[PDB]
Design an enzyme around this catalytic site. Structure first.
Site, PDB file in Angstrom:
ATOM      1  CG  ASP A 207      -8.038   3.115   1.214  1.00  0.00           C
ATOM      2  OD1 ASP A 207      -8.679   4.083   1.674  1.00  0.00           O
ATOM      3  OD2 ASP A 207      -7.680   2.147   1.916  1.00  0.00           O
TER       4      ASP A 207
ATOM      5  CB  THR B  81      -2.069   2.152   9.304  1.00  0.00           C
ATOM      6  OG1 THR B  81      -3.256   1.370   9.129  1.00  0.00           O
ATOM      7  CG2 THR B  81      -1.032   1.326  10.044  1.00  0.00           C
TER       8      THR B  81
HETATM    9  N1  LIG Z   1       5.893  -1.900  -2.610  1.00  0.00           N
HETATM   10  C1  LIG Z   1       6.291  -1.213  -1.513  1.00  0.00           C
HETATM   11  N2  LIG Z   1       7.564  -1.279  -1.073  1.00  0.00           N
HETATM   12  C2  LIG Z   1       7.970  -0.601   0.015  1.00  0.00           C
HETATM   13  N3  LIG Z   1       7.166   0.186   0.747  1.00  0.00           N
HETATM   14  C3  LIG Z   1       5.864   0.344   0.418  1.00  0.00           C
HETATM   15  C4  LIG Z   1       5.344  -0.365  -0.757  1.00  0.00           C
HETATM   16  N4  LIG Z   1       4.045  -0.041  -0.861  1.00  0.00           N
HETATM   17  C5  LIG Z   1       3.758   0.803   0.160  1.00  0.00           C
HETATM   18  N5  LIG Z   1       4.838   1.030   0.923  1.00  0.00           N
HETATM   19  C6  LIG Z   1       4.872   1.903   2.119  1.00  0.00           C
HETATM   20  O1  LIG Z   1       3.817   1.526   3.003  1.00  0.00           O
HETATM   21  C7  LIG Z   1       3.088   2.666   3.455  1.00  0.00           C
HETATM   22  C8  LIG Z   1       1.606   2.431   3.217  1.00  0.00           C
HETATM   23  O2  LIG Z   1       1.035   1.727   4.312  1.00  0.00           O
HETATM   24  P1  LIG Z   1      -0.556   1.528   4.355  1.00  0.00           P
HETATM   25  O3  LIG Z   1      -0.867   0.086   4.663  1.00  0.00           O
HETATM   26  O4  LIG Z   1      -1.127   2.210   3.137  1.00  0.00           O
HETATM   27  O5  LIG Z   1      -0.922   2.425   5.634  1.00  0.00           O
HETATM   28  P2  LIG Z   1      -1.877   3.704   5.461  1.00  0.00           P
HETATM   29  O6  LIG Z   1      -3.124   3.148   4.822  1.00  0.00           O
HETATM   30  O7  LIG Z   1      -2.066   4.203   6.868  1.00  0.00           O
HETATM   31  O8  LIG Z   1      -1.077   4.629   4.580  1.00  0.00           O
HETATM   32  C9  LIG Z   1       3.566   3.862   2.656  1.00  0.00           C
HETATM   33  O9  LIG Z   1       4.144   4.823   3.540  1.00  0.00           O
HETATM   34  C10 LIG Z   1       4.625   3.343   1.710  1.00  0.00           C
HETATM   35  O10 LIG Z   1       5.815   4.119   1.855  1.00  0.00           O
HETATM   36 MG   LIG Z   2      -2.873   3.135   2.371  1.00  0.00          MG
END
Ligand SMILES: Nc1ncnc2c1ncn2[C@@H]1O[C@H](COP(=O)(O)OP(=O)(O)O)[C@@H](O)[C@H]1O
Ligand SMILES: [Mg+2]
Ligand SMILES: Nc1ncnc2c1ncn2[C@@H]1O[C@H](COP(=O)(O)OP(=O)(O)O)[C@@H](O)[C@H]1O
Ligand SMILES: Nc1ncnc2c1ncn2[C@@H]1O[C@H](COP(=O)(O)OP(=O)(O)O)[C@@H](O)[C@H]1O
Ligand SMILES: [Mg+2]
Ligand SMILES: [Mg+2]
Ligand SMILES: [Mg+2]
Ligand SMILES: [Mg+2]
Lengths: 538, 211, 526, 106, 525, 49
Positions: free
Chosen positions: E392, E92
């Site tokens: 994942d 994403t």
């Molecule tokens: N608890 C949280 N609080 C703030 N940001 C978060 C948290 N968990 C994940 N993230 C952010 O969200 C992003 C992950 O998005 P995600 O849905 O995994 O997309 P992808 O699968 O493409 O990485 C990461 O870059 C992370 O920095």
């Molecule tokens: Mg992810």
């Protein structure tokens, strides 16, 4: 200024047959509407006063039933959210065997009230969190609502009384007789070991004499005829063979190589003598009944007739294993005579004629055995199918009782008590989750409301009376369907009791389905395919 | 899908971001086409009708009318440019360019989650300030022959070739000065425009009479 | 009734005269204009949509042309000459198309002026001879032992591709692979980069991790998990025959009349497998690779001797393994000898990349075959990188075969044009005009470079012509990035003489072939 | 009724509910009973039914007549089923069962 | 057009048209996949042509299940597929960064700037960003707590909080079980099995093997306490001669003798197995379990069952290695020389029946190097979603273990990288500063989308976070509950360093290659 | 990845039968070619011969 073009981006890239729905109004409200439609479709068949529905599937097969799971299975549901709710109902059917209609109506009520909460200003996350909190509260409250326990499962009267409520919803007019039959069948099964097998109860459907002529048989009934001249045995000593009743042949390739006239003139005589010797050796052990899963040779049948041996051919291997369990025999892979510890026994094996169908009956005089059969009579195939569904519900209720003996009052008493307690817990919670908790509590009113609607009385008066009585302090008071006016009565005294596991699993599965449907925000549907089903379904 | 499509199944609907994107795309397409018209160094366009008639022009309003377009936003912009041409007689290409650039600059911020209402409020405030500044910057002058010659040249050089523009500048300035009465509105119905098809384009002139 | 009577069959068309020549020249010009913008260091890529749903996003002229389906036979001839240029020297594909188009364009003018095509063809052939002479004259030698010079040549070859960002790594990879593939046996020099320089593309990772291995790499795993996935100094035995019991060629049927014959025959099958495995083991190897299957019993017998087996390896991969590790493929294990055993591999390692198992036979000492492991963003990026690497390796092998170099950046074009014009100044016949036309049409390469750079074509081209009119200015070209004239001795953009000779010959010959043609006939069957 | 862009059940699904559908069921049972009504008693008659292939069957037996009719009404099939059941269990009275059931419903 | 002139049925978009087409496709993909990012992102339900329902939140799963037929979409899908195949996360973010890079580049290209300068700026900014990412990574010993934090960070974005909490422990324990010191982790040794009989929170880790098939003989024991495990790949069913043997007899007795002698080959190996079982365990307490990759005919099944041996046939090929690693035996391709040292050990073997299918559990192993994750749920789509989530999570934990460094999440590193790029911009000569600025603005998309999905406003939250980072110099991200700047390292929001590096490299490469395309042709017909 | 969509903007807004030619190669060269063809058609009837 004539046409509105597709917006640049995803709208233009979408395939010609595909559909995309996004946002509250376009996705969540539509899903809730579809689920409400499905719940309304199945609502009328709820409770003892529920009405059967004639459902004709895509194969012109007619189903006459008031079982929610069967109706949903025969219906061709296309909306994905309603498909998910049907999946939840089928999962409840698989896990417990009863409560599918409860799951459906509870999910429908939950989704309707979730739509109301979304309209008044709440968010999807808040509604989901409140629903989960209220579900946890309900699962905590439920053990306190247990009024009695089975306390005995080897007693015919007690088991029949316990299963009366389970099989009163279907076949309302005559549930005592069916309860007695299923109780006898279940008590024959369920040995000293605590394990109970549902598949050990077999159902045989033969037309002709109405369902009041049904009976339970401690053994097996097969709709076939004996292949020999012997049709009745009084001290049967069944020998079961998984191999065909014929001289075995090489698995590679058989070729009779003849080089002289003597070999040609003696081959058939030797084959006859060998098969006669084998049959005589089998008969010398006392085995007067032979059951085979394969074909029967003509010479084999002749020599079995000569030695007064009853021949029964069971085409299906499932029936063969069931018979082996019934008579305590071992399926011999070769045609060798059975040793003393692998020969089946039965009090009587005979050829009978029930209605107009010839049957072979393996009958035990004792009130025990691994497998018991219920012989269903009736004037219609659909009627016997519905009676078989009721028998399945009763057997599943007995299995649940073996798993967990706790019981909760029926007739809407448990649902009203849960609604009252969760509503009381609602005010103690400050924040936006109180609305969701209160709606979750109110969703339990759909059970007594449906019962009152089907019974022909006013649901509002019934619910008001139930709240009044439960506020007085009586938790075992439910809807009295034996009245022409809205009335209530104690359910513990009346014997209308529901299994604790059924309510627990139904509540859990309905809440999970509603929450999972609520989580969906965007729908991307591919173009429907006219393919003749995937190969996985065969 | 939408509420409208339920009542009328065969209805074309664009909602919210979709409608805004449709409008901005149409405006940007119009701007992309009409960019090359602006200025005396713009490129001549060639318009062929259904019957096959040939029309060469650089005018924004003429090009808007003669493009084969069937878009609603294009229709609205065409109406605005038509009103511009009917009243003032100039600035249609600049009209389209400014509308398209305003929409693009607004979308630059709307795509960042900003609501369009704030952008419109800023547009109103900026328009008020811009009108004040334009009133401050205008050059009041006595409209002698030289200033009118300069204005007519500034228009015609953009419209036509430099030498033809030089001829037409004197023609139009003299024609306007002939019919003008002191402290009276100018009636442009009194300048006949007659077409003859025998000489060169630079032989056009002004006759102090009628044809 | 009364069906029509006619000499030639139905739907048999025929066109003749000036129309055919004009159509052929226009088709060639259209083909040239398709890829006109894909020349020079500042070229922009094109995205091609394959009929089978694939996407070819490339800058190479030959790939673009071969991804395009055309109907006019002249366009077919142009695509064919582009393919021949790609196959012969490895690059110059988009230059030859432009040159041929320009030559046909300048020939059309003489065709319109009552000049027979034979005179034009004769002038073209004389021009081509003088072009070859001048190109050979202005060439310079190259010391192939100088690694820096070879790297600079490969750089000049790949400055126009998408790999110019990692040009240094790409040049090192190409030079190492070409020098590794180079082989000589029985007095026959051979550089077979088509069969022994394999490019393996694994999507993911970063392109900086891509490298050329001192060995081979295949997408295979051990037959049985008990086999070692890491052997330090493996002795490799290569096979191309099944290690399993199989039916004979002749029709054979057994006849069993006694009890023990069936079990005896099955035991003989097992004993045959054991005998084959023992014959293999007698050479004491460490790993066995075959092109056909290996039975489970054979796997057990090999594992008992601590031998790793790879089951089904392609013929080309097995040949590459044999070249890399010095083995020899054999068919009957009973005839296996010590010489056939392949020692020389320095490591056998079967590691996991992503979700797949890959076998590495790297660390070989003096390998004659290699694999180029490419990592990148996606499959299309890796395909384009592979095409650029193929161009680089082809240029390197061309330089190795012919150590001559000529100035780039259009310097050779202008130098040959000036020499041809000077030679034509002494011509007196009518052939001088098409001769000078070819000479001047040669100037289409620097003009295209200037146009792609974005500079003023007329001023820069006039300045370049004036500069080339001097004496020691044959190496003066145009800087394709800054759009200025520069001596190629400073910029260092030099290209192999063989590539230029092939481009010039192909362009002139295509012009001659298309000029010879008239009276197109079509519609007949076979 | 509203279009409901994504429908619940697939197109062509027909649903009938309420008092009218049960009245229709009773009427269908009446029709089925009338189909064999005249073949009862010592003064009964025979019915001739021709199949698709062209062979004709002449019978006074109620079960045979009901089987030969290609009854597709779900409620009317119950009368044929009970006629078959009476034929199987008893063998006689296959007309009286249908007459009595339809008379009860009427 | 030249191509249309040569090929009348050819589709061509050239120069500005080509750039507009590519950028529009990228923007559409970005608009669809914006809502996926973060644990607060929305869930999408995907219905196939056959009516199969799939609930997902992955960028890759959504991309494959999107009904798109666009070339640029195909290129971006290939890039995301490579990202998922190698790193297992960030698809994403990959799509979002590609789309925002293209949008920011078009912002300057529409002002008459050539794309080549933008690509040069992109290259310089990518180099600087990679250097800063090297500077900012946190090299920490990968203890259990850090792995738990990383797994939670992935799974919370993938599933509900309670399910994520369960799957975090499951995934971390599964990875730690099969991990070996300074040895690459083989993810094939973690079997993922789906059962559809309980709730989603019932998913757990079994330190052993779970096989989707059971004993085919009704008389075999359904539960064995102390079991010897015999992993074999030997055919115990009847096999024909390879050379077309056939039988020839002259009498019925001869046929009987041939039938009896026909099975002696298989009976010999069955007798070898039985003799080994008798030798190892002379009592009934110890059990014998035979797991065979090949089939077993009913005769051999009965012969083994009469000796109290549980036999399983047609096992999976990978299950041989999995059982060897878990139980500790030796997979056998023949019974030529089988000895008790080739037998694995299991402290409990029992068969669980669910509907028609049967499952076999092999637990209580001494020190299993191969474990199984039992996915449980009431629906098929729930099982698929949990399977994607655990994929994942396993990828994230393995990546964190591989390189000891770990990168703070919540978009903190994006903000810091953008600030560093802005600081470095004056050092870039020429007009490539515009490309550098575009790259920084494109990198800033992740905190923007996170704030937008959390329900806040992009501009205010982003400016607050940037001001906090500039004032203090710390790595501050987005607090998805309050919107205030938050230190991701202290809270426990972690990102894989390899994922970020792959994101930078792949996004820059694909954006550079797309921006330089000036024509799309379709003329292969 | 099998079809090339129309570019957003004027290309999508153009009517079904309309044609748009823009730029040197698309407009000026085509016009010059058409005029050359017309001159070629009329050329052979010039002068006394
Ligand atoms: N608890 C949280 N609080 C703030 N940001 C978060 C948290 N968990 C994940 N993230 C952010 O969200 C992003 C992950 O998005 P995600 O849905 O995994 O997309 P992808 O699968 O493409 O990485 C990461 O870059 C992370 O920095
Ligand atoms: Mg992810
Ligand atoms: N005699 C009775 N009086 C009142 N209510 C009853 C009686 N018997 C059953 N019920 C109610 O009917 C409900 C069962 O409905 P049923 O049709 O079995 O749906 P499901 O099959 O989904 O459980 C129970 O909740 C019980 O309270
Ligand atoms: N940096 C540069 N400056 C000027 N000209 C260059 C430069 N690099 C390559 N060229 C010229 O570009 C040509 C190569 O362009 P290329 O795209 O490889 O065409 P082809 O595929 O036909 O070889 C060579 O003739 C060379 O003279
Ligand atoms: Mg029930
Ligand atoms: Mg003007
Ligand atoms: Mg080249
Ligand atoms: Mg009678």
């Amino acid at each position: 200024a004539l046409h509105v073009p597709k917006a640049p981006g995803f709208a233009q890239m979408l395939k010609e047959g595909a559909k995309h729905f996004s946002g509250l109004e376009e996705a969540v409200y539509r899903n809730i509407q579809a689920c409400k439609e499905l719940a309304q479709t199945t609502r009328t068949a709820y409770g003892p006063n529920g009405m059967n529905k004639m459902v004709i599937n895509h194969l012109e097969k007619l189903f006459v039933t008031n079982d929610a799971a069967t109706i949903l299975r025969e219906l061709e549901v296309q909306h994905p959210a309603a498909k998910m709710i049907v999946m939840a109902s089928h999962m409840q059917e698989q896990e417990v065997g009863d409560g599918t209609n409860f799951v459906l109506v509870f999910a429908g009520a939950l989704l309707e009230l979730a739509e109301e909460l979304l309209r008044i200003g709440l968010s999807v996350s808040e509604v989901i969190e409140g629903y989960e909190i209220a579900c946890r509260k309900a699962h905590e409250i439920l053990p306190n609502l247990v009024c009695c326990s089975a306390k005995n499962l080897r007693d015919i009267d007690e088991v029949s009384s316990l299963l009366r409520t389970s099989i009163m919803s279907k076949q309302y007019g005559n549930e005592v007789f069916l309860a007695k039959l299923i109780a006898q069948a279940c008590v024959s099964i369920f040995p000293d070991s605590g394990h109970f097998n549902v598949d050990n109860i077999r159902v045989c459907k033969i037309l002709g004499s109405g369902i009041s002529s049904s009976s339970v048989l401690h053994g097996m009934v097969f709709k076939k005829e004996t292949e020999g001249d012997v049709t009745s045995v009084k001290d049967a000593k069944i020998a079961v063979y998984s191999c065909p009743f014929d001289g075995m042949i090489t698995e590679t390739k058989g070729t009779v190589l003849i080089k002289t006239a003597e070999e040609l003139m003696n081959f058939s005589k030797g084959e006859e003598n060998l098969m006669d010797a084998q049959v005589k050796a089998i008969a010398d052990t006392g085995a007067n009944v032979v059951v085979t899963g394969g074909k029967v040779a003509d010479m084999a049948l002749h020599y079995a007739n000569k030695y007064n041996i009853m021949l029964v051919r069971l085409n299906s291997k499932w029936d063969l294993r069931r018979l082996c369990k019934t008579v305590g025999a071992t399926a011999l892979p070769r045609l060798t005579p059975p040793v003393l510890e692998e020969m089946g026994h039965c009090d009587s094996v005979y050829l009978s004629e029930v209605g107009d169908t010839q049957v072979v009956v393996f009958k035990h005089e004792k009130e025990d055995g691994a497998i018991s059969t219920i012989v269903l009579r009736g004037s219609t195939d659909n009627l016997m199918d519905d009676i078989e569904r009721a028998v399945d519900d009763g057997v599943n209720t007995f299995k649940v009782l073996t798993r967990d003996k706790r019981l909760v009052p029926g007739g809407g008493a448990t649902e009203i008590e849960l609604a009252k307690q969760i509503t009381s817990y609602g005010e103690t919670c400050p924040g936006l989750e109180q609305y969701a908790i209160k709606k979750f509590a109110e969703a339990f009113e759909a059970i007594p409301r449906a019962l009152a609607e089907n019974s022909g009385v006013k649901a509002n008066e019934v619910i008001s009376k139930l709240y009044a009585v439960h506020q007085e302090g009586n938790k075992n008071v439910g809807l009295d369907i034996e009245a022409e006016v809205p009335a209530v009565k104690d359910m513990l005294e009346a014997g209308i009791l529901d299994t604790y596991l059924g309510k627990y699993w139904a509540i859990k599965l309905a809440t999970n389905a509603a929450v999972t449907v609520l989580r969906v925000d965007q729908i991307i549907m591919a173009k429907p395919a006219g393919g003749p089903k995937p190969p996985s379904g065969k | 899908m939408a509420a409208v499509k339920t009542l009328n199944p065969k209805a074309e609907v664009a909602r919210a971001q979709a409608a805004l994107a449709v409008n901005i795309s149409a405006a940007r397409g119009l701007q992309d086409v009409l960019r090359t018209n602006l200025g005396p160094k713009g490129t001549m366009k060639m318009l062929v009708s259904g019957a096959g008639d040939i029309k060469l022009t650089k005018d924004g309003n003429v090009l808007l009318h003669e493009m084969q377009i069937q878009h609603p936003t294009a229709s609205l912009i065409a109406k605005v440019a038509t009103a511009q041409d009917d009243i003032t007689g100039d600035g249609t290409t600049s009209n389209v360019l400014i509308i398209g650039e305003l929409l693009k600059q607004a979308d630059l911020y709307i795509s960042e989650g900003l609501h369009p209402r704030i952008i419109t409020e800023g547009f109103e405030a900026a328009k008020e300030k811009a009108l004040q500044f334009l009133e401050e910057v205008k050059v009041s002058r006595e409209m002698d022959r030289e200033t009118l010659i300069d204005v007519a040249r500034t228009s015609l050089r953009t419209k036509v070739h430099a030498e033809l523009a030089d001829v037409l500048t004197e023609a139009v300035v003299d024609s306007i000065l002939a019919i003008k009465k002191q402290d009276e509105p100018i009636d442009l119905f009194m300048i006949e425009i007659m077409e003859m098809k025998h000489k060169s384009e630079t032989d056009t002139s002004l006759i102090r009479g009628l044809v | 009734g009364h069906r029509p009577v006619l000499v030639l069959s139905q739907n048999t068309k025929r066109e003749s005269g000036r129309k055919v020549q004009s159509g052929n020249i226009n088709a060639a010009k259209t083909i040239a204009d398709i890829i006109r913008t894909c020349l020079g260091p500042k070229s922009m890529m094109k995205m091609l949509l394959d009929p089978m749903g694939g996407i070819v996003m490339t800058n190479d002229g030959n790939a673009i042309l071969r991804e395009i389906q055309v109907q006019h036979p002249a366009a077919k001839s142009m695509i064919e000459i582009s393919r021949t240029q790609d196959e012969e020297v490895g690059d110059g594909t988009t230059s030859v198309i432009i040159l041929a188009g320009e030559m046909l364009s300048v020939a059309e003018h003489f065709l319109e002026q009552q000049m027979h095509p034979t005179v034009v063809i004769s002038a073209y052939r004389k021009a081509l001879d003088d072009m070859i002479s001048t190109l050979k004259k202005i060439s310079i030698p190259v010391d192939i032992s100088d690694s820096d010079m070879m790297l600079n040549i490969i750089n000049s070859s790949i400055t126009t591709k998408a790999i110019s960002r990692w040009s240094s790594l790409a040049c090192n990879i190409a030079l190492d692979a070409v020098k590794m593939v180079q082989f000589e046996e029985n007095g026959r020099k051979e550089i077979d980069i088509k069969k022994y320089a394999r490019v393996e593309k694994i999507p993911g990772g970063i392109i900086e991790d891509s490298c050329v291995l001192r060995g081979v790499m295949i997408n295979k795993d051990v037959t049985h998990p008990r086999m070692r996935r890491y052997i330090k100094n493996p002795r490799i035995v290569l096979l191309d025959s099944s290690l399993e019991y199989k039916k004979g060629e002749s029709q054979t049927d057994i006849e069993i009349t006694r009890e023990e014959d069936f079990t005896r025959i099955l035991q003989m099958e097992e004993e045959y497998i054991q005998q084959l495995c023992e014959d293999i083991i007698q050479l004491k190897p460490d790993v066995v690779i075959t092109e056909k299957g290996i039975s489970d019993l054979a796997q057990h017998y090999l594992m008992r001797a601590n031998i790793t087996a790879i089951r089904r390896v392609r013929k080309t991969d097995n040949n590459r393994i044999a070249r890399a590790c010095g083995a020899r493929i054999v068919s009957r294990p009973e005839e296996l000898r010590e010489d056939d055993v392949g020692t020389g591999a320095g490591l056998l390692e079967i590691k996991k990349i992503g979700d797949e198992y890959f076998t590495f036979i790297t660390d070989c000492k003096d390998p004659k075959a290699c694999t180029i492991l490419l990592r990148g963003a996606s499959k299309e990026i890796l395909s384009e990188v592979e095409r650029n690497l193929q161009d680089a390796m082809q240029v390197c092998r061309n330089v190795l075969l012919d150590p001559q170099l000529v100035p780039g950046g259009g310097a050779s074009e202008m130098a040959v044009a000036h020499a041809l014009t000077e030679k034509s100044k002494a011509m007196t016949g009518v052939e001088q005009w098409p001769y000078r036309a070819v000479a001047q049409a040669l100037e289409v390469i620097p003009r295209t470079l200037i146009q792609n750079c974005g500079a003023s074509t007329i001023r820069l081209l006039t300045s370049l012509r004036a500069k080339h009119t001097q004496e020691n200015c044959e190496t003066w070209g145009v800087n394709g990035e800054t759009g200025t004239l520069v001596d190629m001795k400073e910029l260092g953009i030099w290209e192999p003489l063989a590539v230029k000779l092939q481009t010039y010959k192909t362009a002139v010959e295509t012009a001659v072939l298309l000029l010879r043609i008239d009276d197109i006939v079509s519609g007949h069957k076979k | 009724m509203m279009p409901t862009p994504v429908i619940l059940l697939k197109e062509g699904t027909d649903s009938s509910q309420g008092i009218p559908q049960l009245v229709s069921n009773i009427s269908a049972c009446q029709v089925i009973a009338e189909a064999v009504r005249t073949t009862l008693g010592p003064r009964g008659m025979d019915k001739l039914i021709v199949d698709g292939r062209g062979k004709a069957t002449i019978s006074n037996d109620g079960a045979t007549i009901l089987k030969l009719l290609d009854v597709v009404h779900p409620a009317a099939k119950t009368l044929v089923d009970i006629a078959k059941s009476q034929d199987a269990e008893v063998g006689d009275g296959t007309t009286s069962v249908t007459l009595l059931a339809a008379e009860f419903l009427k | 057009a030249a191509v249309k002139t040569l090929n009348p049925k050819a589709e061509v978009a050239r120069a500005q048209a080509a750039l507009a087409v590519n950028i529009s496709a990228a923007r559409g993909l970005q608009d669809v996949l914006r809502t996926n990012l973060g644990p607060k992102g929305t869930m999408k339900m995907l219905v196939s042509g056959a009516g199969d329902i799939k609930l997902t939140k992955d960028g890759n799963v959504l991309l494959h299940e999107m009904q798109i037929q666009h070339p640029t979409a195909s290129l971006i899908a290939k890039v995301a597929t490579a990202q998922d195949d190698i790193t297992g996360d960030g698809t994403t973010s990959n799509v979002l960064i590609i789309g925002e890079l293209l949008k920011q580049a078009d912002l300057y290209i529409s002002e008459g700037l050539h794309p080549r300068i933008i690509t040069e700026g992109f290259e310089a900014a990518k180099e600087k960003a990679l250097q800063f990412l090297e500077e900012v990574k946190v090299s920490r010993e990968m203890d259990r707590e850090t792995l738990i934090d990383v797994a939670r960070t992935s799974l919370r974005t993938k599933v509900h909080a309670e399910l994520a909490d369960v799957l975090t422990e499951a995934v971390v324990d599964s990875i730690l079980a099969i991990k070996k010191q300074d040895e690459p982790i083989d993810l094939f040794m973690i079997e993922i099995m789906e059962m559809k009989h309980k709730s989603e929170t019932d998913t757990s880790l079994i330190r052993g093997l779970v096989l989707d098939h059971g004993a085919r003989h009704p008389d075999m024991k359904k539960r064995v306490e102390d079991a010897y495990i015999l992993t074999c790949n030997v055919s115990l069913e009847y096999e024909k001669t390879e050379v077309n043997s056939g039988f020839f007899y002259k009498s019925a007795e001869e046929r009987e003798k041939l039938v009896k002698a026909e099975r002696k080959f298989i009976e010999d190996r069955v007798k070898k197995i039985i003799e080994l079982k008798r030798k190892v365990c002379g009592d009934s307490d110890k059990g014998f379990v035979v797991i065979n990759q090949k089939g077993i005919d009913p005769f051999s099944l009965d012969a083994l069952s009469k000796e109290g041996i549980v036999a399983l046939r047609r096992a999976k090929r990978r299950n041989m290695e999995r059982l060897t690693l878990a139980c500790g035996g030796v997979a056998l391709n023949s019974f030529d020389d089988l000895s008790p040292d080739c037998l694995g050990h299991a402290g409990l073997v029992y068969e669980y029946t669910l509907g028609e299918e049967k499952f076999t559990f092999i637990e209580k192993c001494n020190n299993p190097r191969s474990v199984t994750l039992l996915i449980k749920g009431p629906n098929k789509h729930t099982l698929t979603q949990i399977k994607d989530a655990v994929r994942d999570g396993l990828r994230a934990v393995k990546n964190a273990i591989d390189d000891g460094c770990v990168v703070p999440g919540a978009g903190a590193v994006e903000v810091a990288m953008a600030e560093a790029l802005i600081k470095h911009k004056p050092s870039v000569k020429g007009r490539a500063q515009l490309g550098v600025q575009a790259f920084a603005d494109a990198l800033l998309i992740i905190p923007k989308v996170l704030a937008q999905n959390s329900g806040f406003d992009l501009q205010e939250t982003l400016v607050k976070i940037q001001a906090e980072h500039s004032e203090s110099g710390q790595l501050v991200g987005v607090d998805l509950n309050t919107g205030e700047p938050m230190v991701a390292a202290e809270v426990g929001v972690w990102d894989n360093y390899c994922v970020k590096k792959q994101l930078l490299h792949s996004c820059t490469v694909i954006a550079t290659n797309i921006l330089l395309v000036d024509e799309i042709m379709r003329a292969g017909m």
